[PDB]
């Protein structure tokens, strides 16, 4: 809204990053790394083949690596006797790294409002179920 | 007459609107088709996670086009219901005109033609559902497992899955099911079918439905209590 | 001017002349060149036959509509097949009802209405194919050029294709030549060979390119190829 | 002959409701204020005529037409669309009923057919919806007195007392406080004259006001009585001269 | 729009011009037209050992003496195949004689050269331009064995050696040298397998490679998995000495 | 200022070649018809490319064939990857 | 924006295309005057005078639809002849289904609905003309119905069009208030025609000759149009007063 | 603005741009004129010579409706030819049902609704050419020009194309020449001179003269093309005036 | 993705859902809440109404409560006008099976026909889908009582207790918490009234704003009894259940 640029900004911007690698030859020093959500809609010239020879794809971590992230945030957390770390990892399905610490934050605030030392297992159960479905519960149409 | 069909043709030769019909498989419920020596088994996934949902009155993804032929699909139930109705009308028309039973190879040519005719012609949107047609040839016990893609092409597969995480399940099919020596026993084909559904259903019971097709027009669906009998044996094999 | 005005055949220009008419002429220049002429006795059409590689068969540009008539396609392939089949029925419809062969002057009038139907209504592809229609009737030899706009104009001779100005200029030197020549098809055939050579860049002079078809009071329309056209070449 | 998407009925509002409905209710909201009231012994409807040019004749434009005289009608909506709708409503009411049952059409069946006409304009692409707001007031022997309001959206609902127009928001409160279910037809006519007057007070006479009521069957309005069993027309349109007689006594 | 109704100012079209991309992205189809009959072959491109190569076919038999090689989208090509089978039999209904392969290819193109829906004076069976191309072969009593190329855009051409698909540009340069009018039946079969193996990254076996021939005596014969593997072994013996 | 005609292009092409070295065997009346609808700038490029052809081949003078070769170039719509044609 | 070019409703809930239908009505800038008398109907329309290369007799804004029926159109002339043939077709077909003279009130209803169908269709555009139908009815006598291009119709004592219609409507409004009657005295239709010319000249402020105007006349069981000699004869008796 | 992008759209000026641009398209074509006499009409058109390869006096833009009516037009040739063929079926259909030739003032009535319908439908393209027609009917001499907007009026003279107004200067002189109007044969020599006068700015290209007329006092109401000594006499008269 | 393209029904979104469909249930959610309840001894149907005006007559008119036949009785949640054609078409198809086969139509035969009607607009033609939520309460001997829910889709899903319209997730939570495996009819009436009270912003929950229709064989004196309950009887039920 505030800063637009019009249709002419697309040509002078995306091609300016190309003119940095295309307009200069630097053997060993400058290493340009580009990152965004979707690189497909970008200009194939902006990709500048031959400078970037490696394509790295991102995927969500599996259940084996979730215990390493969960154990760090729960290292300073007081857990009850009925709370198991293997249960929260199995419940998580298609979640990012910030979603692991989100359930620990939500379950920690529930016991903080009630002033409890060890967080009860009921807070962990309500955290993993709620954070699972919040924004989009249904496909809204058909089964897909 | 509405439009010519699909404009712009896409730059890559495959229209995005046609690609959206193919990419619709990678999200919705998974259906793992398999076949053995003497029979064929088509697995399906119906989500019971929603509470107060009656699973008895809700038909599963398995539909019988012919006495010896069934059909399994993953996608929109509305677009697939037409594929079920139009196939059964042709299934009866084939038995009316030629007096012979429904040919598994010929039936898929018409079902793929339904999605083809609506995709080629204009004004009609292409279907976003893919169906797995499995049946037995007349006077033959060898199962035939085919597939009808919304792009208008058909292909045969020994073991093929449709649904989310299909690439992971496809690796489970190649590393276990062997085209040269498939499992002869029915119990082995049912247990390995549920194991393929464990990567999607993720430890569930009512979400797994197994349908076994036997020759001489014999088709029975395993009850929820009978499915848990095979799942119990799978849980014992995980610790081994 | 992509889209905006003139992007559709219905939308006009601010000047009033639709640019789609002028853009349809560019399709003729992209196709093969076809040179033709006539006289008071016979008529000769010289069409160039190209291909992709040596293994590619040379496409024949001359399509036979009638026994006494002939045409050539310098334009798009699909647009001519609809017109060639339409004019094919008109020759038999005139022989079935009126019993008279389709007149070359009357063929251009009915063909003029077929090209407007795409521009008059919405949708479809307009006809930009160059067509040189010849024939022999009791009125003599006639050659009527078909423009991509649909206009039909009779000429002693003309050429349609890439750089057609070179072949049209040679017809100005010979303007007093082929008209006075009567009953001598040899000089009429040699006039078409030197006419197309001026426009061409001299790619291949062999006999698999030039296609010569002649019609007259004695010999009817006949497509010559191979050793038939190898006499003059 | 079909041109591309010209049947497109894609327009939709971000709220989910049809945008054609909101733009239709907006135009009627600014229009002339009509009203209607269903009383115990009768039903009264009233509206203000259109002035426009001072040389225009009020007898030419009639905002109350007649389908069959068991039912009255009044519209605050599109003027031209009313003539087309009545022409189609009669042909549907005659074909689906009078060509079968050969009698006066009932109120419940007639309103359901009028709602389909407004739907066919919305269902068929390229045709704009009817911007008319109709008040269908009729009296039958089953439901008795019935007053229905057909919105341009295509749906109908019954109303004891309702008003449509510029003062429709203010008249809705006036009909609640002033009018009650215990009031009869004579009590509703005086309220209809006061509520309609509060909209435009420029001219309160009967020349710009068209008043019509559905009363008991009148044998003189039918033109013939050979059968004592056959009921006369229940709909009677009041003369503008008769309207001024009630204004002096009001 | 930029469709068939919108004509480009440069003298070309949009939708149909891009249809050549689907041809260039198709499977490799190689064939050679000689006096001893045409030897056709394609690449079925098995994407997994669970795929059954006998059920899927990229080579369809239109007639006993006439057959085609389908490389492209199977959906758009199957509609032309049903019209090709109908037209070939319809010609035998009014004639009952061996039809010219060029005449049969033209009859297939008669439906294949028209597209769209709205038309003033004629019905439209098709709808959208198809991006599939086929190689039609056959034999007659006039010009002998002929090999064509099915183009939905323009008029078909007669090609002695033609390659389409992903290996079109790669195999086209090889057909301008090794091809000769004296190539026998055995030399033609070994040359197709030699060129197809080079343009193919995977291994050469009977699963991903299926060939067929059109002759006068046997008509159109499909090479089974047993004979195709024998022809591959003959290629290995020739490559071992070279 | 429309495009020069036959006799108009012949005099323009002759002036730009006055500073070159030829065998005087060149007839510009044939080259004027070889040039089809060329502006004043497209005519000047003819004499420029004509000298470059004889320069790379080691020719002492510019013959008539160098002018024809210099005018011919693709540009236009040539080298068509488009469908149809036929 | 696109909201002006669409046939469906606008963001204001009011169609702009209906308003644009009146833009073409002022192209000719013709001021028509038609009043309702006792036994007769007088219609006077301005006839634009072109150069000497055109025939002023062939130029007319008034056409004969049927017996006793006539129509004056203010707007596009080429769009008027297309609408004139529609009214003539419905006039003859009405008598075949009934057999009595077609009244003017019904003729204004048919042409209004047909012009309204064009408003609903996404292809056919509405008529940008003004349909004013005049005749002498059997029961209702002289009547004038002015049909709007969007399908609205209402009767007028004295109709007026063009940019100067405010001068004609106001000058004839006070004239009807003094007599308190919509009709005109002198039942003979000869002087009634002359009464409309004087009121038109005083309202427009310019005296027009016989070639600057055309006068339609609607009588009982007859319809005709005054020629150049009849219109000139009217100005003779008006000049003497 | 955006009113010209879609067909049949009401502009704030009251007329569509495509209808306005259709009138300007007539000036891009050849100039055709006409003369309305007492007992008949005279038509004079102009055909441009593309090059020396054109065959003299073969293609005739003058069309004849039945035997009693001539038809000429200007601007786009193919767009005007379809309108002629439309009137051919209408003049024949009227002769079949009513057993009588079609009158001239009503001949534009059938084509008036036809051309008007092309300015209404969206998918249908309006006509961009002007058409002049005339002849001798039972009502005598009549001349009418059909505008691309679908309007026509009685015309004592006809002019269209690029030189239309250059012809109007000469056509208005015939009114001052005689109050009754020139004769049928006298108008042939005057219509030829106008063609040479309107070509003064057109001298970049050549032209050929084509004249046709229909009169009751000569052919008894039969349209005939000028040929023989009558053509050479009109050319020699116009050649001496332009000197 | 970047630009939102909604033009024709053939155009597909990168999410795979037609933008015309995005507003189908959101317009239904904008309307009242219709909650069906399938029990062992019958089926209880309860739905509120969108009209907030007091002058409107809610006693003699049922907006969301309709009766297709003596057995199948449904509830329309969505646009009232656009559903009028599909309801009469359902009554035509219901009589077609009864005309030919001389037998009452079951639920499955009626749902399969009404399913293709919704898809008929989205599949072929440039028309629009009419968003409607059908709650099917039928009667069947084979499967017993059947309860289905039809979105503007063309598919059906079986449900013991379903909730559509406004507060879909809020009302479904109250149903799954108080759900009982026994599920009598009188208990189904209490769970229907208590759920609509918390979802509706009005705490009084007047009788005229509710549609109470119960299909039950467990009525008084142990007999099968079917009735369309007037608001006069609804007011007495709200007092017995403790709502008023």
The angle at the Cα of B67, spanning B65 to B72, to the nearest 5 degrees, equals 40
Burial class (CB in 10 A: 0-12, 13-18, 19+), H31: buried
Rg for chain C, CA atoms, rounded: 18
> What tokens appear for C138 in the block?
């009791």
The span from the CA of D169 to the CA of D174, in Å, is 9
Q: Does I116 touch chain B (CB under 8 A)?
A: yes
Q: Cβ D4–B2 below 8 Å, yes or no?
A: yes
The span from the CA of B110 to the CA of B104, in Å, is 10
- DSSP class of residue I185? H
Q: State how many domains chain H has.
A: 1
The span from the CA of G221 to the CA of D136, in Å, is 42
DSSP labels, chain B: ---SSSSS--TTSS-HHHHHHHHTTTTS--EEEEE-SS-EEEEEE----SSS--SSSS--S-EESSSSEEEEEES-HHHHHHHHHHHHHHHHHHHHHS-S---HHHHHHHHHHHHHHHHHSSSBPPP--EEEEEEE-TT---EEEEEE-TTS-EEEBSSEEESTTHHHHHHHHHHH--SSS---SHHHHHHHHHHHHHHHH-S-STTEEEEEEETTTEEEEPPHHHHHHHHHHHHHHH--
3-state SS of I186-233 is HHHHHHHHHHHHHHCCCCCCCHHHEEEEEEECCCHHHCCEEEECCHHH
CATH: 3.40.30.10, 3.30.300.350, 3.60.20.10, 3.20.130.10. Which one for D1-249? 3.60.20.10
SS3 H215: strand
G147 half-sphere exposure, CB direction, 13 A CA radius: 30
- DSSP class of residue C228? G
Q: State how many domains chain B has.
A: 1
Q: Does E6 touch chain B (CB under 8 A)?
A: no
For residue E194, how many other CB atoms are within 10 A of its CB?
17
> What tokens appear for B147 in the block?
């597939």
SS3 G43: strand
CB of H91 closer than 8 Å to CB of H130? no
Chains G and H touch each other (3 or more Cβ pairs < 8 A): yes
DSSP labels, I135-167: EEE---SSS-S-EEEE-TTS--EE-SEEEESTT
Q: Does F41 touch chain E (CB under 8 A)?
A: no
Domain of residue B228, CATH code: 3.60.20.10
For chain A, give the longest Cα–Cα distance. Answer: 64
Q: Cβ C23–E7 below 8 Å, yes or no?
A: yes
Task: Look at the block and give the residue holding tokens 């059938």.
Answer: H110
Closest CA to E150 of E234, E73, E36: E73
* Domains defined for chain G, CATH in brackets: 1-241 (3.60.20.10)
Q: What are phi and psi of H78, to 5 degrees?
A: -65, -35
> What tokens appear for E155 in the block?
């008029």
SS3 E213: strand
The span from the CA of I84 to the CA of I73, in Å, is 15
Closest CA to I188 of H179, B52, E92: B52
DSSP labels, B95-116: HHHS-S---HHHHHHHHHHHHH
Q: Does C84 touch chain F (CB under 8 A)?
A: no
CB of B48 closer than 8 Å to CB of B189? no
CB of C43 closer than 8 Å to CB of C214? yes
How many residues belong to chain B? Answer: 240
Task: Look at the block and give the residue holding tokens 């730059």.
Answer: B11
- DSSP class of residue C151? -
> What tokens appear for E184 in the block?
């026998």
CB of D149 closer than 8 Å to CB of I56? no
Task: Look at the block and give the residue holding tokens 């007092």.
Answer: I239
For residue C118, how many other CB atoms are within 10 A of its CB?
21
- DSSP class of residue C41? S
CB of E106 closer than 8 Å to CB of E138? no
Task: Name the minimum distance, in Å, from the CA of F44 to any CA of chain C.
Answer: 21
Residues H108-145, buried b or exposed e (16+ Cβ, 10 A)? bbbbbbbbbebbbbbbbbbbbbbbbbbbbbeeebbbbb
Q: Is the dihedral of CA H68, H72, H77, H80 positive or negative?
A: negative
Q: Cβ D5–B3 below 8 Å, yes or no?
A: yes
The span from the CA of G41 to the CA of G64, in Å, is 14
Residue numbers in I near A41 (CB within 8 A):
1-2
SS3 H159: strand
Q: Cβ I176–B52 below 8 Å, yes or no?
A: yes
Which residues of D fall below an 8 Å CB-CB distance to H?
Answer: 1, 3, 6
The span from the CA of I150 to the CA of B77, in Å, is 12
Residue numbers in F near E151 (CB within 8 A):
83, 86
Closest CA to I188 of I152, I237, I143: I237
- Residue-number span of the structural domain to which B23 is assigned: 1-240
SS3 A20: helix
In chain F, which residue's Cα lies nearest the Cα of C60?
A: F86
Q: Does C1 touch chain H (CB under 8 A)?
A: no
Burial class (CB in 10 A: 0-12, 13-18, 19+), B238: exposed
CB of G134 closer than 8 Å to CB of G71? yes
Residue numbers in A near I21 (CB within 8 A):
140-141
Burial class (CB in 10 A: 0-12, 13-18, 19+), I132: buried
Closest CA to I205 of I157, I242, I172, I233: I242
Q: Where are the alpha helices (DSSP H) in E7-162?
A: 19-24, 74-94, 101-112
CB of C98 closer than 8 Å to CB of C90? no
SS3 E66: strand
Burial class (CB in 10 A: 0-12, 13-18, 19+), I197: middle
- Residue-number span of the structural domain to which C45 is assigned: 3-233
Chains F and E touch each other (3 or more Cβ pairs < 8 A): yes
Per the rule left: phi > 0, alpha: psi between -120 and 50, beta: everything else, E100 is: beta
Closest CA to A92 of A65, A121, A123: A65
Contact partners, residue H77, CB within 8 Å, separation at least 6 = C112, C149, C150, C151, H29, H61
CB of I61 closer than 8 Å to CB of D156? no
Residue numbers in C near E153 (CB within 8 A):
77-78
Edge to edge, the sheet with strand D209-214 lists: D161-164, D34-38, D43-48, D209-214, D235-237
The span from the CA of C147 to the CA of C153, in Å, is 8
* Chains touching E, CB cut-off 8 Å, 3+ pairs: B, C, F
The span from the CA of H178 to the CA of H191, in Å, is 16
Compare CB distances from B123 to I12, I124, I162 and report the shortest one's residue: I124
Chains B and F touch each other (3 or more Cβ pairs < 8 A): no
Compare CB distances from B153 to E48, E51, E74 and report the shortest one's residue: E74
Cα–Cα distance list, H213 to C143, H80, H208, H234 (Å) = 29, 20, 17, 13
**Residues paired with C38 in a beta bridge:** C43
The span from the CA of H183 to the CA of H195, in Å, is 19
- DSSP class of residue A50? T
The angle at the Cα of I243, spanning I242 to I244, to the nearest 5 degrees, equals 95
3-state SS of A85-122 is HHHHHHHCCCCCCHHHHHHHHHHHHHHHHCCCCCECHH
Which residue ranges make up each domain of chain D? 1-249
The span from the CA of G107 to the CA of G104, in Å, is 5
**Residues paired with H157 in a beta bridge:** H35
SS3 G234: helix
D28 half-sphere exposure, CB direction, 13 A CA radius: 26
Cα–Cα distance list, E11 to C9, C32, E151, F82 (Å) = 14, 14, 20, 10
Q: Does C157 touch chain F (CB under 8 A)?
A: no
The span from the CA of C149 to the CA of C162, in Å, is 18
The span from the CA of C129 to the CA of C74, in Å, is 6
Q: Where are the alpha helices (DSSP H) in chain D?
A: 19-30, 79-93, 107-123, 168-178, 185-197, 219-222, 240-248
The span from the CA of G133 to the CA of I12, in Å, is 53
Burial class (CB in 10 A: 0-12, 13-18, 19+), A2: exposed
Beta strands per DSSP E along G12-149: 33-36, 41-46, 62-66, 69-73, 131-137, 141-147
Contact partners, residue H217, CB within 8 Å, separation at least 6 = H39, H40, H184
> What tokens appear for D76 in the block?
């605050």
SS3 G124: coil
Domain of residue I131, CATH code: 3.60.20.10
Q: State how many domains chain C has.
A: 1
SS3 F70: helix
Burial class (CB in 10 A: 0-12, 13-18, 19+), D247: middle
Active-site residues of H, by number, are 30
Cα–Cα distance list, B109 to B155, E210, F11 (Å) = 10, 21, 72
Interface test with D, best of H117, H118, H120, H122 (most D CBs within 10 A): H122
Method of structure determination: cryo-EM
CB of H41 closer than 8 Å to CB of H182? no
Q: Does D12 touch chain I (CB under 8 A)?
A: yes
Compare CB distances from B54 to I13, I116, I158 and report the shortest one's residue: I158
The span from the CA of H233 to the CA of H188, in Å, is 10
Q: State how many domains chain I has.
A: 1
The span from the CA of E138 to the CA of E88, in Å, is 12
For residue E239, how many other CB atoms are within 10 A of its CB?
11
Residue numbers in H near C168 (CB within 8 A):
51, 53
- DSSP class of residue D223? S
DSSP element (H, E) containing H78 = helix H77-98
The span from the CA of F79 to the CA of C194, in Å, is 26
CB of D76 closer than 8 Å to CB of D130? no
DSSP element (H, E) containing D73 = strand D71-75
* Domains defined for chain E, CATH in brackets: 1-242 (3.60.20.10)
The span from the CA of C84 to the CA of C75, in Å, is 13
CB of D209 closer than 8 Å to CB of D220? no
Closest CA to I180 of I158, I157, I159, I160: I160
CB of C55 closer than 8 Å to CB of E160? yes
Task: For chain G, report the end-to-end CA distance as a whole number of angstroms.
Answer: 58
Q: Cβ D2–B1 below 8 Å, yes or no?
A: yes
What helix, strand, coil percent values describe chain A, rounded to 5?
A: 45, 5, 55
Q: Cβ E6–C78 below 8 Å, yes or no?
A: no
After which residue numbers is chain F interrupted with C–N beyond 2.5 angstroms?
Answer: none
SS3 H98: helix
CB of G59 closer than 8 Å to CB of H154? yes
The span from the CA of C140 to the CA of C118, in Å, is 33
Rg for chain D, CA atoms, rounded: 19
The span from the CA of H23 to the CA of B84, in Å, is 59
Compare CB distances from H120 to G58, G59, G125 and report the shortest one's residue: G125
For residue E206, how many other CB atoms are within 10 A of its CB?
20
Q: Cβ D154–I81 below 8 Å, yes or no?
A: yes
């Amino acid at each position: 809204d505030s800063n637009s640029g019009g249709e002419r900004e697309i040509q002078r911007t995306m091609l300016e990053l190309l003119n940095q690698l295309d307009g200069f030859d630097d053997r060993g020093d400058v290493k340009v790394i580009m990152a965004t959500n979707k690189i497909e809609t970008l200009d194939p010239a902006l990709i500048r083949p031959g400078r970037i020879d490696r394509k790295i794809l991102f995927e969500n971590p599996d259940l084996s690596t979730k215990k390493k992230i969960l154990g760090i945030h729960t290292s300073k957390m007081n857990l009850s006797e009925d709370v198991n770390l293997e249960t929260l990892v199995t419940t998580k399905d298609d979640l990012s790294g910030a979603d692991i610490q989100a359930m620990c934050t939500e379950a920690g605030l529930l016991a903080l409002r009630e002033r409890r030392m060890q967080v009860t297992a009921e807070d962990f159960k309500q955290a993993k179920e709620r954070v699972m479905k919040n924004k989009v519960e249904e496909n809204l149409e058909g089964l897909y | 007459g509405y439009d010519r069909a699909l404009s712009i043709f896409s730059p890559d030769g495959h229209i995005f609107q046609v690609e959206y019909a193919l990419e619709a498989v990678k999200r919705g419920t998974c259906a793992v088709g398999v076949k053995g020596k003497n029979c064929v088994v088509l697995g399906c996934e119906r989500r019971s996670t929603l509470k107060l949902q009656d699973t008895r009155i809700t038909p599963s993804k398995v539909s019988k086009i012919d006495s010896h032929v069934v059909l399994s699909f993953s996608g929109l139930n509305a677009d697939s219901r037409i594929l079920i109705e139009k196939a059964r009308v042709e299934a009866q028309s084939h038995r009316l005109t030629l007096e012979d039973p429904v040919t598994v190879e010929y039936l898929t040519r018409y079902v793929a033609g339904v999605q083809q005719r609506y995709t080629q012609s204009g004004g009609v949107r292409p279907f976003g559902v893919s169906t797995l047609i499995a049946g037995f040839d007349p006077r033959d016990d060898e199962p035939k497992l085919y597939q009808t893609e919304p792009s208008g092409i058909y292909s045969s597969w020994s073991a093929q899955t449709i649904g989310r995480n299909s690439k992971t399940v496809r690796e489970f099919l190649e590393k276990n099911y062997d085209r040269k020596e498939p499992p002869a026993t029915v119990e082995e084909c049912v247990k390995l079918t549920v194991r393929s559904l464990l990567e999607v259903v993720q430890t569930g019971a009512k979400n797994i439905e197994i349908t076994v097709v036997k020759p001489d027009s014999d088709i029975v669906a395993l009850s929820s209590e009978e499915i848990n009998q095979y799942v119990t044996q799978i849980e014992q094999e995980k610790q081994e | 001017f992509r889209n905006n005005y003139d992007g559709d055949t219905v939308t006009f220009s601010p000047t009033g002349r639709l640019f789609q008419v002028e853009y349809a002429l560019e399709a003729i220049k992209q196709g093969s060149v076809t040179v033709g002429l006539r006289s008071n006795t016979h008529a000769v059409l010289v069409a160039l036959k190209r291909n992709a590689d040596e293994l590619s068969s040379y496409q024949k540009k001359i399509i036979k509509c009638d026994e006494h008539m002939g045409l050539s396609l310098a334009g798009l392939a699909p647009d001519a097949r609809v017109l060639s089949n339409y004019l094919r029925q008109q020759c038999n419809y005139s022989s079935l009802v009126f019993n008279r062969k389709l007149a070359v002057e009357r063929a251009g009038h009915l063909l003029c209405d077929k090209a407007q139907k795409n521009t008059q209504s919405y949708g479809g592809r307009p006809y930009g194919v160059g067509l040189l229609i010849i024939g022999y009737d009791k009125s003599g030899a006639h050659l009527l050029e078909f423009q991509p706009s649909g206009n039909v104009t009779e000429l002693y001779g003309t050429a349609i294709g890439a750089r057609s100005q070179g072949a049209k200029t040679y017809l100005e030197r010979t303007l007093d030549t082929f008209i006075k020549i009567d009953g001598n098809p040899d000089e009429l055939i040699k006039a078409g060979v030197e006419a197309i050579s001026q426009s061409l860049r001299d790619e291949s002079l062999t006999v698999d390119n030039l296609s010569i078809a002649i019609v007259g009071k004695d010999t009817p329309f006949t497509i010559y190829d191979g050793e038939a056209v190898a006499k003059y070449i | 002959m079909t041109d591309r998407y010209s049947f497109s009925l894609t327009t939709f509002s971000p709220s989910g409701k049809l945008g054609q409905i909101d733009y239709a209710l907006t135009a009627v909201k600014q229009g002339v204020t009509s009203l209607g009231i269903k009383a115990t012994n009768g039903v009264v409807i009233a509206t203000e005529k259109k002035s426009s040019s001072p040389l225009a004749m009020s007898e030419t434009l009639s905002k109350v037409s007649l389908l069959t005289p068991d039912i009255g009608a009044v519209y605050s909506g599109m003027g031209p669309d009313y003539r087309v709708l009545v022409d189609k409503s009669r042909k549907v009411a005659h074909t689906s009923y009078k060509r079968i049952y050969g009698e006066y059409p009932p109120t419940k069946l007639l309103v359901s057919e009028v709602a389909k006409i407004m739907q066919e304009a919305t269902q068929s692409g390229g045709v704009r919806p009817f911007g008319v707001s109709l008040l269908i007031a009729g009296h039958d022997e089953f439901n008795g007195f019935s007053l229905y309001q057909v919105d341009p959206s295509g749906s109908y609902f019954p109303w004891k007392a309702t008003a449509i127009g510029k003062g429709s928001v203010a008249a809705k409160t006036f009909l609640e406080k002033r009018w009650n279910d215990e009031l009869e037809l004579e009590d509703a006519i005086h309220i209809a004259l006061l509520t309609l007057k509060e909209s435009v007070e420029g001219e309160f006479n009967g020349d710009t006001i068209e008043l019509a009521i559905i009363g008991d069957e009148n044998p003189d309005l039918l033109g013939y009585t050979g059968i004592p069993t056959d009921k006369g027309p229940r709909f009677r349109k009041l003369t503008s001269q008769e309207i001024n007689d009630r204004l002096e006594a009001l | 729009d930029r469709g068939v109704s919108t004509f480009s100012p440069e003298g070309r079209l949009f939708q149909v011009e891009y249809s050549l991309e689907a041809i260039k992205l198709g499977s490799t189809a190689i064939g050679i037209a000689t006096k001893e009959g045409v030897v056709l072959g394609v690449e079925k491109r098995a994407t997994s050992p669970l795929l059954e190569s006998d059920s899927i076919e990229k080579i369809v038999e239109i007639d006993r003496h006439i057959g085609c090689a389908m490389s492209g989208l199977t959906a758009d090509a199957r509609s032309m195949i049903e019209h090709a089978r109908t037209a070939a039999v319809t010609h035998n209904l009014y004639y009952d004689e061996d039809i010219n392969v060029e005449s049969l290819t033209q009859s297939v193109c008669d439906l294949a050269l028209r597209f769209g829906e709205g038309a003033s004076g004629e019905e439209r069976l098709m709808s959208r331009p198809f991006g599939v191309a086929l190689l039609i072969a056959g034999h007659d009593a006039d010009d002998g064995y002929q090999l064509f190329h099915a183009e939905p855009s323009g008029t078909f051409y007669r090609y002695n050696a033609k390659a389409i698909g992903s290996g079109s540009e790669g195999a086209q340069a090889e057909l301008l040298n090794e091809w000769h009018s004296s190539l026998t039946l055995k030399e033609a079969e070994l040359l197709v397998l030699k060129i197809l193996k080079q343009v193919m990254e995977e291994k050469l076996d009977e699963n991903n490679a299926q060939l067929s021939c059109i002759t006068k005596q046997d008509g159109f014969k499909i090479y089974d998995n047993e004979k195709t593997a024998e022809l591959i072994k003959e290629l290995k013996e020739k490559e071992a000495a070279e | 200022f429309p495009l020069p005609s036959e006799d108009s292009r012949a005099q323009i092409l002759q002036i730009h070649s006055r500073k070159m070295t030829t065998d005087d065997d060149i007839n510009w009346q044939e080259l004027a018809r070889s040039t089809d609808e060329f502006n004043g700038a497209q005519l000047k490029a003819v004499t420029v490319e004509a000298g470059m052809i004889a320069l790379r081949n080691g020719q002492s003078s510019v013959k008539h064939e160098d002018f024809v070769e210099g005018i011919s170039e693709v540009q236009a719509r040539k080298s068509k990857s488009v469908s149809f044609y036929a | 924006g696109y909201d002006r070019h669409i046939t469906i409703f606008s963001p204001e809930g009011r169609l702009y295309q209906v308003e644009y239908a009146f833009k073409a009505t002022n192209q000719t800038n013709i001021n028509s005057l038609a009043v309702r008398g006792k036994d007769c109907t007088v219609v006077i329309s301005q006839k634009k005078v072109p150069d000497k290369l055109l025939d002023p007799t062939t130029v007319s804004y008034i056409f004969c639809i049927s017996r006793t029926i006539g129509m004056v159109v203010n707007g596009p002339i080429p769009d008027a002849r297309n609408a004139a043939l529609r009214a003539k077709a419905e006039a003859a077909e009405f008598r075949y289904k009934y057999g009595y003279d077609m009244p003017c009130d019904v003729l204004a209803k048919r042409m209004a609905n047909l012009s309204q169908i064009y408003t609903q269709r996404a292809y056919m555009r509405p008529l940008g003309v003004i349909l004013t139908f005049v005749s002498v009815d059997e029961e209702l006598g002289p009547s004038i119905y002015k049909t709007d291009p969007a399908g609205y119709y209402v009767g007028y004592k004295a109709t007026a069009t063009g940019p100067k219609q405010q001068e004609i409507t106001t000058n004839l409004e006070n004239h009807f208030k003094k007599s308190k009657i919509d009709h005109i005295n002198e039942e003979s239709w000869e002087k009634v025609v002359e009464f409309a010319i004087t009121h038109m000249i005083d309202a427009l402020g310019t005296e027009f000759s016989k070639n600057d105007l055309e006068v339609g006349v609607a009588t009982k069981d007859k319809f005709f149009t005054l020629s150049a000699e009849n219109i000139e004869e009217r100005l003779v008796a008006i000049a003497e007063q | 603005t955006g009113y010209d992008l879609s067909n049949s759209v009401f502009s704030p000026d009251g007329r569509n741009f495509q209808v306005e641009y259709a009138v300007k398209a007539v000036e891009n074509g050849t100039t055709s004129i006409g003369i309305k006499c007492n007992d008949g009409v005279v038509f004079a058109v102009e055909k441009l010579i593309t090059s020396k390869l054109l065959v003299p006096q073969k293609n005739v833009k003058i069309q004849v409706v039945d035997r009693h009516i001539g038809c000429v037009y200007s601007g786009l040739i193919p767009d005007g030819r379809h309108l002629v063929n439309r009137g051919r079926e209408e003049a024949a259909s009227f002769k079949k049902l009513y057993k009588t030739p079609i009158p001239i003032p009503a001949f534009a009535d059938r084509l008036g609704q036809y051309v008007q319908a092309h300015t209404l439908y969206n998918s249908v393209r309006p006509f961009g050419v002007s058409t002049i027609f005339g002849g001798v009917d039972k009502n005598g001499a009549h001349l009418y020009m059909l505008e691309p907007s679908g309007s026509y009026w009685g015309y004592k003279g006809a002019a269209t194309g690029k030189g239309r107004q250059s012809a109007k200067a000469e056509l208005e002189k015939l009114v001052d020449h005689h109050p009754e109007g020139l004769s049928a044969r006298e108008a042939v020599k005057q219509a030829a001179k106008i063609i040479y006068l309107a070509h003064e700015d057109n001298k970049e290209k050549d032209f050929e003269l084509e004249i046709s007329w229909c009169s009751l006092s000569e052919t008894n109401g039969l349209h005939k093309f000028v040929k023989g000594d009558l053509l050479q006499e009109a050319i020699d008269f116009a050649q001496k005036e332009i000197n | 993705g970047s630009r939102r393209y909604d033009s024709r029904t053939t155009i597909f979104s990168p999410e795979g859902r037609l933008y015309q469909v995005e507003y189908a249930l959101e317009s239904i959610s904008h309307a009242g809440t219709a909650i069906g309840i399938m029990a062992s001894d019958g089926i209880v149907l309860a739905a509120e109404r969108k009209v907030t005006s007091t002058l409107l007559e809610q006693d003699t008119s049922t907006e969301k409560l309709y009766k297709l036949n003596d057995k199948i009785a449904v509830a329309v949640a969505g646009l009232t006008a656009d559903a009028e054609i599909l309801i009469n078409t359902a009554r035509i198809h219901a009589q077609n099976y009864l005309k030919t086969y001389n037998e009452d139509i079951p639920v499955e035969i009626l749902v399969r026909r009404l399913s293709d009607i919704k898809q008929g607009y989205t599949q072929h033609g440039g028309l629009r889908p009419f968003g409607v939520s059908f709650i099917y309460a039928g009667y069947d001997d084979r499967y017993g009582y059947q309860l289905y829910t039809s979105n503007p889709s063309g598919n059906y899903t079986g449900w013991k207790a379903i909730s559509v319209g406004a507060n879909t997730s809020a009302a479904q939570t109250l149903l799954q918490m108080d759900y009982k495996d026994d599920m009598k009819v009188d208990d189904a009436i209490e769970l229907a009234l208590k759920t609509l009270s918390k979802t509706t912003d009005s705490s009084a929950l007047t009788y005229d704003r509710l549609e109470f229709a119960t299909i039950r064989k467990g009525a008084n004196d142990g007999e099968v009894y079917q009735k369309i309950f007037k608001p006069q009887e609804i007011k007495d039920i709200l007092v017995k259940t403790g709502i008023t």
